[PDB]
Design a protein around this ligand. Structure first.
Ligand code: ATP
Ligand code: ATP
Ligand code: ADP
Ligand code: MG
Lengths: 97, 139, 146, 184, 48, 384
């Protein structure tokens, strides 16, 4: 960006936003997991460990998509294997270009 | 006597009924409409109209001179009426499209599966899609 | 009341208008939909301070006499954010950005609730915030949230 | 905290209603009662219990420890308001008012809960506060007060799906429907 | 000051006041007072 | 109302006595020539009767029209709001003057005859580009420069406040003022103190926002800009960062650099047109003084060329004293160590380090600012 925008008296504060670690991939799964109809026994920690830090948008990109698996096998409770069935697909799109 | 006057008020209806559209009302039994002529008006009602048959987009009826509410209308659209269903399908089968296993199943997921199995999307609560955009190279 | 409606229903329609601003001697300046601006009068039951600029009105058509104030229409910004439709957010959907919350509160939250607190130090209040990092990291929901 | 708080009332049932079986219940119920700062809910349970003549210093050390948490709230309310966060007075006692809910009676619970209900602009705290009012509504068998915050609770789950706040809630309505004789 | 004020105390009795929205001074217009009010308006057309 | 402009005297003079008593002559004699009107011919009130006779000529449906031409024998072609224009006549209460081609007027409803004229609600652009109030403190806020302050007061302030020195000399002020140097040196900050000092109408425009996306809207914006600048009175037009019209190319502009060029031709006219210019002073500022057209930098279009050097270290300590004036400075700090931290630090660097150090104090809720706040403050501000 502009050096005139990089005048030190111009900008008051610049804040960096890192991609999430294993700790901060878990809680976005936690808040994002609220509106889903789950199945008891999930171990979200493993699911957060399966994603090696894409961003906070692939969290919703997986966990919204996991309901399509339970719906395409006509469940009414989303199970844990839907999520590992989803991470290897969305992370295949991470593996796509 | 009130049944005699009860039928008397509808003489303003006749044939030349203003074709406007309901927008809102200030109060009880006095409203604001917009005509099909292009302008808007502050109009009166006729009392026998069930007011709970109002406010979607259904076209109301206006007098051509005095210009007040006359009668509620069943909906109308000229565009493409409703795809008349007899000689209207372009008789393309699903088998006629070869090699679209992802997208043919995927648009089925988005369009007609919430159409039919609505309560699965309701019960799991996964927010079924409102509209869909599709694109790409031509042909 | 039922019998009067055969006779009263013999009147014309009332126009809708739009007050730009009022002027001297009990008169206002009112435009129509696609019809030009008119310098018209007011009726006796309407106050000038009650006449607000940028407000619709009911108008009679024969003498263009002012009839009644039309409720309201829109702000020119409510329609704007209505078109834009940002995803409204909150602190309860923040995923692990807690120090950044504390950083943005110091710049934005403090010179609203406590502007005197900077005059306790004799420095000016900040104005500009740069948020940077990869996309998909919570920038839009954070700025909407604050 | 209110998470082990149902076992307390179940062991009050275990104290009172079996008449011959009232010894180990008043042993372990005291084992939980004269620790973890409990003051109010066992004076009449002490009346249904034996004398327990020297409970005075036992009450004094715990009204003193209760006074410690009260006065550090009284050390928090003025530092919280000097440079304000999200109303950090009600953000401190929005968590320690459940401590005051267990330790104090329902009043210092209720004025602080209906107090802090207007603080958070999202239901992520509100609906948990309402869950707490439901749980004390079971405790004092507040059969009219549960009818309010059940509907006021359920009025929040429609935005979002919130199935850890709806299926969890169904356990509360199920325990109410088996508390009353509504088996189907 | 009383004669500079009495300037205003009779110049309000003349009529130059009522700060307009586009009117003439009230002494300026008396050509169209009785004759051209009904002469430059009532016989006269628009002639678009 | 503009009755007698002789208000000289400034003591107990008899001229003042006899002249005010001769205003008492024109007012006592002719207040006795005010009594007789309604005494002899009442016949109306004339305060509202003839007024309501005009108001009974003109109807309540007052259509708003637009002028485009004038024929003198009180009829002209006026534009309707639809577009279908008429050839109506003009009344006698129309005060035949405030009538220009393009003016908003008041017409009849029936025959659309020219009833009245309308005061114009102007355009928002004037309020947009017009500075309303004084921005900040005076020239004492600046510090250390002290040489070109006499230059800007010389070319701008002194011609305004003292119109005697140029007339005893038989001379006119220099026209154009330009300001150039490194960035952050206080170029806009001087114009802040100028906008404090002057009583003239002040306009400010950035050189980036000159450029447009449509064709000719740039030079048209120039023409209406200097129109607005002239149509007031004594005025000061400020231009910030005029190199940006030549440096950065944007894809919003449909024309290429040969549309920017034509905008520079229009502005190049508007500095030194053959027209009578008026009392409009021009103050400009940039940092890339070498990039733009020297045809605009010639004497006649810009007369005074003002460079801003970097602050020397004895002026730096003054600027530290300025930006650390009203703050609770703990005695831990030594400003001389803060002076030689950067060898070419700007005045903005000092203020940034001060404000961020105050931010470091407010992270820890203290009242005074200590030395380590500056130690990590120069790391935060400078080194990244
Ligand atoms: N299975 C198939 N996949 C792709 N194309 C096919 C297939 N079968 C036939 N086609 C040919 O491709 C064309 C698709 O027609 P269609 O009008 O849908 O193209 P399009 O993608 O809409 O492009 P355009 O928008 O330019 O019409 C047909 O003319 C047909 O001849
Ligand atoms: N000599 C100085 N003394 C005190 N403060 C200064 C000085 N120079 C600059 N500053 C401060 O730095 C800030 C930026 O200065 P200014 O805007 O004049 O820079 P500039 O050269 O005009 O930049 P540009 O012209 O490229 O926008 C001002 O707010 C001002 O307070
Ligand atoms: N900390 C977080 N908690 C929950 N969701 C998050 C978080 N960070 C990002 N998201 C997701 O990312 C989206 C917002 O992306 P954001 O980074 O704000 O927009 P942009 O990509 O334009 O910066 C939200 O829809 C949300 O689901
Ligand atoms: Mg500057």
């Amino acid at each position: 960006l502009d050096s005139a925008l990089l005048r030190p008296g111009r900008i008051d504060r610049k804040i960096e936003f890192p991609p999430p670690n294993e700790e901060a991939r878990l809680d976005i799964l936690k808040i994002h997991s609220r509106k889903m109809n789950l199945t008891r026994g999930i171990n979200l920690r493993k699911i957060a460990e399966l994603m090696p830090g894409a961003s906070g948008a692939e969290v919703k990109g997986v966990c919204t998509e996991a309901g399509m698996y339970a719906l395409r096998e006509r469940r009414v409770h989303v199970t844990q294997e839907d999520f590992e069935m989803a991470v290897a697909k969305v992370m295949q799109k991470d593996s796509e270009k | 006597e009130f049944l005699h006057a009860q039928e008397e008020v509808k003489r303003i209806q006749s044939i030349p009924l203003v074709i406007g559209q309901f927008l809102e009302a200030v109060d009880q039994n006095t409203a604001i409409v917009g005509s099909t002529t292009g302008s808007n008006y502050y109009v009166r009602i006729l009392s026998t109209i069930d007011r709970e048959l109002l406010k979607p987009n259904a076209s109301v009826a206006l007098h051509k001179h005095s210009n007040a509410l006359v009668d509620v209308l069943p909906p109308e659209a000229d565009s493409s009426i409703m795809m008349l269903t007899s000689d209207q399908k372009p008789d393309v089968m699903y088998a006629d499209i070869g090699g679209m296993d992802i997208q043919k199943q995927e648009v089925r997921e988005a369009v007609e599966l919430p159409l039919t199995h609505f309560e699965l999307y309701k019960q799991i609560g996964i927010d079924p899609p409102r509209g869909v955009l599709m694109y790409g190279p031509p042909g | 009341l039922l019998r009067e409606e055969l006779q009263l229903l013999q009147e014309q329609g009332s126009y809708v208008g739009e007050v730009v601003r009022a002027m001297d001697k009990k008169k206002v300046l009112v435009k129509v939909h696609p019809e030009g601006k008119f310098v018209v009068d007011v009726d006796k039951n309407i106050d000038i301070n009650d006449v607000t600029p940028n407000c619709r009105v009911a108008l009679r058509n024969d003498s263009y006499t002012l009839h009644k104030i039309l409720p309201n229409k829109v702000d020119p910004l409510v329609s704007l954010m209505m078109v834009e439709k940002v995803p409204d957010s909150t602190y309860e959907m923040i995923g692990g950005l807690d120090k950044q919350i504390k950083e943005i509160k110091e710049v934005i939250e403090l010179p609203v609730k406590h502007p005197e607190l900077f005059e306790a130090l004799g420095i000016a209040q900040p104005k500009g915030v740069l948020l940077y990092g990869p996309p998909g990291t919570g920038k839009t929901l954070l700025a909407r949230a604050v | 905290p209110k998470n082990p708080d149902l076992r307390i009332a179940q062991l009050r049932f275990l104290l009172s209603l079996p008449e011959h079986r009232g010894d180990a219940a008043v042993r372990d119920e005291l084992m939980a009662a004269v620790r973890d700062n409990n003051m109010a809910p066992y004076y009449e349970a002490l009346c249904k219990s034996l004398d327990w003549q020297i409970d005075v210093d036992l009450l004094n050390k715990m009204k003193k420890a209760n006074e410690d948490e009260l006065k550090r709230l009284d050390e928090e309310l003025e530092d919280a308001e000097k440079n304000l966060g999200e109303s950090e007075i009600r953000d401190a006692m929005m968590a320690k008012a459940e401590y005051l809910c267990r330790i104090g009676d329902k009043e210092g619970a209720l004025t602080a809960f209906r107090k802090t209900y207007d603080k958070t602009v999202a239901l992520g705290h509100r609906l948990d506060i309402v869950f707490y009012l439901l749980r004390i509504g079971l405790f004092y068998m507040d059969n009219d007060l549960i009818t309010r915050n059940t509907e006021k609770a359920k009025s929040l789950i429609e935005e979002g799906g919130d199935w850890d706040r709806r299926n969890r809630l169904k356990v509360y309505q199920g325990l109410y429907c088996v508390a009353i004789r509504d088996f189907k | 000051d009383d004669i500079q004020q009495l300037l205003k105390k009779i110049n309000e009795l003349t009529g130059i006041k009522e700060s307009d929205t586009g009117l003439a001074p009230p002494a300026l217009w008396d050509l169209a007072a009785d004759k051209q009010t009904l002469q430059s308006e009532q016989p006269l057309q628009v002639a678009r | 109302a503009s009755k007698l402009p002789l208000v000289t005297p400034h003591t107990q003079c008899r001229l003042k006595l006899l002249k005010l008593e001769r205003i008492k002559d024109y007012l006592l004699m002719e207040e006795e020539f005010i009594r007789n009107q309604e005494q002899m011919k009442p016949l109306e009130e004339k305060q509202e009767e003839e007024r309501s006779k005009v108001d009974d000529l003109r109807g309540t449906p007052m259509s708003v029209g637009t002028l485009e031409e004038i024929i003198d024998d009180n009829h002209a072609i006026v534009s309707t709001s639809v577009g279908s224009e008429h050839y109506v006549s003009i009344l006698s209460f129309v005060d035949k003057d405030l009538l220009e081609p393009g003016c908003s007027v008041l017409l009849n409803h029936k025959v659309h005859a020219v009833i009245g004229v309308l005061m114009d609600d102007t355009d928002p652009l004037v309020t947009v580009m017009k500075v309303e109030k004084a921005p900040q403190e005076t020239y004492a806020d600046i510090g250390g420069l002290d040489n070109q302050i006499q230059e800007i007061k010389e070319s701008v302030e002194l011609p305004l406040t003292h119109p005697e020195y140029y007339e005893e000399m038989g001379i006119k002020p220099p026209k154009g003022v330009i300001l150039y140097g490194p960035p952050g040196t206080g170029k806009t900050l001087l114009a802040k103190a100028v906008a404090n000092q002057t009583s003239a109408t002040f306009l400010r425009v950035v050189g980036s926002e000159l450029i447009q996306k449509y064709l000719g809207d740039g030079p048209k914006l120039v023409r209406e800009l200097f129109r607005v600048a002239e149509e007031h009175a004594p005025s000061i037009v400020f231009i910030d960062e005029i190199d940006a019209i030549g440096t950065k190319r944007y894809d919003s502009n449909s024309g290429g650099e040969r549309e920017i060029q034509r905008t520079m031709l229009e502005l190049l006219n508007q500095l030194d047109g053959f027209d009578s210019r008026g009392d409009v002073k021009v103050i400009m500022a940039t940092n890339r003084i070498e990039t733009l057209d020297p045809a605009l930098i010639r004497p006649g279009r810009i007369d005074r060329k003002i460079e801003f050097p970097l602050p020397d270290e004895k002026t730096k300590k003054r600027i530290f004293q300025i930006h650390t004036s009203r703050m609770t400075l703990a005695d831990d700090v030594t400003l001389d160590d803060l002076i030689m931290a950067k060898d070419d630090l700007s005045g903005a660097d000092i203020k940034a380090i001060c404000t961020e150090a105050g931010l470091m104090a407010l992270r820890e809720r203290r009242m005074k600012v200590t030395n380590e706040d500056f130690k990590k403050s120069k790391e935060n501000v400078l080194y990244k």
